[PDB]
Amino acid sequence: SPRLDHTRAVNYFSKVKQLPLVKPYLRSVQNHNNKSVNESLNNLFITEEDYQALRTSIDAYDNFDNISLAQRLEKHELIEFRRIAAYLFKGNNRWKQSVELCKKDSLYKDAMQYASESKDTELAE
Amino acid sequence: IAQADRLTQEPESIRKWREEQRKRLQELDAASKVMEQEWREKAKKDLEEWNQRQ
Q1: DSSP alpha helix (H) spans, chain A
Q2: Spatial separation of the C-alpha atoms in residues B19 and B33, rounded to whole Å
Q3: Of the candidates A13, A66, A59, the residue with the CA atom closest to the CA atom of residue A36
Q4: Closest to A49 (Cβ–Cβ): which among B39, B46, B53?
Q5: Can you tell me the distance from the alpha carbon of A102 to that of A88, in angstroms, rounded to the nearest whole number?
Q6: Largest alpha-carbon pair distance within chain A?
Q7: Half-sphere exposure of A120 toward its Cβ, with a 13 Å CA cutoff?
Q8: How far does B39 lie from chain A, in Å, by closest CA?
Q9: Which residues carry this modification: Phosphoserine (chain A)?
Q10: With an 8 Å Cβ cutoff, is B46 touching chain A?
Q11: Which of A31, A43, A66, A110 is the most exposed place for a label (fewest CB within 10 A)?
Q12: d(Cα A125, Cα A73) in Å, to the nearest integer?
């Protein structure tokens, strides 16, 4: 733990096709807010289908690429991440989430709640 | 230098090389053989990962 750079590790795992063993290695760790951690960590919770962790895996540590990440999620069928990719893209910025809807993901539900916090008034019209 | 030794320079001499080039062997070959049956068991580790989780 103490006295590794982490940055020079996850790299050897990723191009190894075996990185998940480090799953728990990322447990007590991920306080380092390090990128390789969240970055593939998410990639992990994504293909693995984890949302509880993934959500909490980012409910604090905000060190990552707030973009493409939600790009692979939208391409899903299981709205779990198409629901969070919705969040992930919006993230403390409500304008994205709504201005990106259409037939699908038009939920008669959360759609009537994510507008409220907005500030661009006219968006109501 | 000098030189002039032999019966002391070759008796233990023959020991090291011989009893060392076959005490070599092993590890290396052992390495991949076992490294084989292993990493692959890993490939299934992750594979069954996929299966259940889906």
Answers
A1: 10-14, 35-47, 52-56, 68-74, 79-90, 94-98
A2: 23
A3: A13
A4: B53
A5: 18
A6: 56
A7: 10
A8: 9
A9: 68
A10: yes
A11: A31
A12: 29
Where residue A63 falls (left for φ over 0; alpha for ψ -120 to 50; beta otherwise) is beta
| A39 class by beta-carbon count within 10 Å (0-12 exposed, 13-18 middle, 19+ buried) | middle
- Interface residues of A toward B, Cβ cutoff 8 Å, are 17-18, 20, 48-49
Resolution reading in Å? 7.9
What are B34's two structure tokens?
Answer: 């076992």
B53 to A18: CB separation less than 8 angstroms, yes or no: no
Strand, helix or coil for residue B1: coil
Chain A nearest CA to B48, separation (Å): 12
Nearest to B53 among A17, A18, A48 (CB): A48
**CA dihedral over A72, A77, A80, A85, signed as positive or negative:** positive
Amino acid of residue A39? E
What is d(CA A84, CA B45) in angstroms, rounded to the nearest whole number? 28
